[PDB]
Write a protein that binds this DNA or RNA. Structure first.
Length: 497
DNA sequence: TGTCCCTTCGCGTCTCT
DNA sequence: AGAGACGCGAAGGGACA
């Protein structure tokens, strides 16, 4: 948007304003979101057929249009969607959301067109479910994954003895075509030579960049075992758990350095690299471990804990940066900050804690101890933000104590629990006669949302299990193990009674 | 410059157990 | 309770027209 022509760009700001206009109603964040990954052709196209997409047969929502648009070749997809959505939904049985899901990717046109062209031959001749075809296609380069699945599924299943589930698992990723081809080539080589169960070979391929990881494993598997004293199992961990090529390479490169000079066990090095962006975590503990754990206060064990997660790099960097301010200015022990950072999205929690500790403690009346409990979970940021937002409405409109709201929030998926309590606490308490503290009890666990959702569905529309269990029982189960422990009981009557 | 494809990395939620 | 699977999606890069 720099150097090609004098004057104009007048037509661009004309449309940019009108998209705030009624059909779509886009905010600033959305427009820039489109502009960035979709380009201007995208922004133009959105405008161009903003009415056509909102009503008509399509009846897409605004956020759906935005989703489709904000990708390389967005214009192309938006067009192909208008054209093919109804035929895919009617003549092949898909939901609109499924069509949108296929479209909301780079090269959406190609995916949509290839789905239409091959959803039958796959479902009929290879016995795949349409869910599975959508899964393969709902990615970048879906056309290629689809096309490759067709070509290699017979060969992979007969010759190399794989389930279709496994082929799908492989293809249902970015660069499936690659992962598939690379497996075909390297399945025999990896199996009889480097001694790996086919299950392990599929494990590795069933991530993004699987081709890389397969190739890199074959190459580096011997080395890492003899020279660096790892097990084949440990090597496969690193390769399958997200690290891929990058992590394997980085392990080789930094295993001696981290063990000898920085004093870690090879167990800990493997734990760190067996993750997404292992490379990043390893390089981030090579530096930063000294200054963290020898000036910034912590023990190696604690540093290994923070790094042994997705985005460990981010966590370490934001710990090192905010450990002083949080300890000093907000009065938290290092042990609390480590707890906050030792989760997925540590960076996000620490930063959110920083900006909301005061707010929660002043305006909403909470101990810091409570805030840290909320923050010391997966998706801490989300809970904190949701607590702030929903604490008042829960306490007033639904009559809960703060201590209850905090208890709900203090689990992985806190946000979801809170939101779901708000939704269902009414219908549960009046229509089916549960008592708030029961509803809170159910919710105050991991998987609290689906626990609730699951417990409602049971009462409102009783299944074969004809009562058998009373309401008070179901609640006990639901607290005991949520949806699993509910589906499990259901599945102890279906073919039974 | 836009479109398509591939790889790497990070965030959030649930379940195993 | 913590570890690990899963889903979702941003971000970065390469190839080609």
């Amino acid at each position: 948007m720099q150097w090609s022509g004098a004057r104009a760009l007048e037509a661009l700001l004309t449309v940019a304003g009108e998209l705030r206009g009624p059909p779509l109603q886009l905010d600033t964040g959305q427009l820039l979101k489109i502009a960035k990954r979709g380009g201007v052709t995208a922004v133009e196209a959105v405008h161009a057929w903003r009415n056509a997409l909102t009503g008509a047969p399509l009846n897409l929502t605004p956020e759906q249009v935005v989703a489709i648009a904000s990708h390389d070749g967005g214009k192309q997809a938006l067009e192909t969607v208008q054209r093919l959505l109804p035929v895919l939904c009617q003549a092949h049985g898909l939901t609109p959301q499924q069509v949108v899901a296929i479209a909301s990717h780079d090269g959406g046109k190609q995916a949509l067109e290839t789905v239409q062209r091959l959803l039958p031959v796959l479902c009929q001749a290879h016995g795949l479910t349409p869910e599975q075809v959508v899964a393969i296609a709902s990615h970048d380069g879906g056309k290629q994954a689809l096309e490759t699945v067709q070509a290699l599924l017979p060969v992979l299943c007969q010759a190399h003895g794989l389930t279709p589930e496994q082929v799908v698992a492989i293809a249902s990723n970015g660069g499936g075509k690659q992962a598939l081809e690379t497996v075909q080539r390297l399945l025999p080589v990896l199996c009889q030579a480097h001694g790996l169960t086919p299950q392990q070979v599929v494990a590795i391929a069933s991530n993004g960049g699987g081709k890389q990881a397969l190739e890199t494993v074959q190459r580096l598997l011997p080395v890492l075992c003899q020279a660096h004293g790892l097990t084949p199992q440990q090597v496969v961990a690193i390769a399958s758990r997200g690290g891929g090529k990058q992590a394997l390479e980085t392990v080789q490169r930094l295993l001696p350095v981290l063990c000898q000079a920085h004093g870690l066990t090879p167990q800990q090095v493997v734990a760190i690299a067996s993750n997404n962006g292992g490379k990043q975590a390893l390089e981030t503990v090579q530096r930063l471990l000294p200054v963290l754990c020898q000036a910034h206060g912590l023990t190696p064990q604690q540093v290994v804990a923070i790094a042994s997660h997705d985005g460990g790099k981010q966590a370490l960097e934001t710990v090192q940066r905010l450990l002083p301010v949080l300890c000093q200015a907000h009065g938290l022990t290092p042990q609390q900050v480590v707890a906050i950072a030792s989760n997925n999205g540590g960076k996000q929690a620490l930063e959110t804690v920083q900006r909301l500790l005061p707010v929660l403690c002043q305006a909403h009346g909470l101990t810091p101890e409570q805030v840290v409990a909320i923050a010391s979970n997966g998706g801490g940021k989300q809970a904190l933000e949701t607590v702030q937002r929903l604490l008042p409405v829960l306490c007033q409109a639904h009559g809960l104590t703060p201590e209850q709201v905090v208890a709900i929030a203090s689990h992985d998926g806190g946000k979801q629990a809170l939101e779901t309590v708000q939704r269902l606490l009414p219908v549960l308490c009046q229509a089916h006669g549960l008592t708030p503290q029961q509803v809170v009890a159910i919710a105050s666990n991991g998987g609290g949302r689906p626990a609730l959702e699951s417990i409602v569905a049971q009462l409102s529309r009783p299944d074969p299990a004809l009562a058998a269990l009373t309401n008070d029982h179901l609640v006990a189960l639901a607290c005991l193990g949520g949806r699993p422990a509910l589906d499990a009981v259901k599945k102890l009557e279906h073919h039974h009674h």
